[PDB]
Amino acid sequence: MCDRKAVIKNADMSEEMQQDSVECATQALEKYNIEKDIAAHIKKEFDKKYNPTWHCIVGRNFGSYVTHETKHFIYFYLGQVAILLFKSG
Amino acid sequence: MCDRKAVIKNADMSEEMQQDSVECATQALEKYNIEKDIAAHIKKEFDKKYNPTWHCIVGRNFGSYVTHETKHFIYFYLGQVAILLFKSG
């Protein structure tokens, strides 16, 4: 019907910022029903509000290696999908 | 054959470099039985030979928005599994 639950895997950034991602992801899913837009949406918001550059990813399942900045990284599993975010300009 | 067929979708880098990724992904997959290790392996190899910084992802299904450099970007589905590679230091 609408299964969904947060499950932070790891995060290194201000609570409000990481929490923002949680809502940014939740709302992102509500608007977009495909990881492509979900990630791209979240990225723009963080890149525009928190200043560039943010890299975003979303998927039901996937592994990846990535390098980011500092105090600007977060990753959490929501429902049947994962939402990754971190600056790596 | 045993499936594991490459399927280039996006590419923006030296032929040998992109082809290297194809083999790097193919070999990476046969080495590790988890897309997570795949990216980490492929990434280190490119950051080692090509020099940092490379972002690599591998998953059964997902989507992500990311900005890279130039002449250092590539993406392709291998054996159904997605395998992304691109510099975005």
Binding site: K9, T70 | K43
Partner: peptide, 9 residues
């Protein structure tokens, strides 16, 4: 503002 880190669902 620079550090590598793995990630997986």
């Amino acid at each position: 503002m620079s550090c590598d880190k793995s990630t997986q669902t």
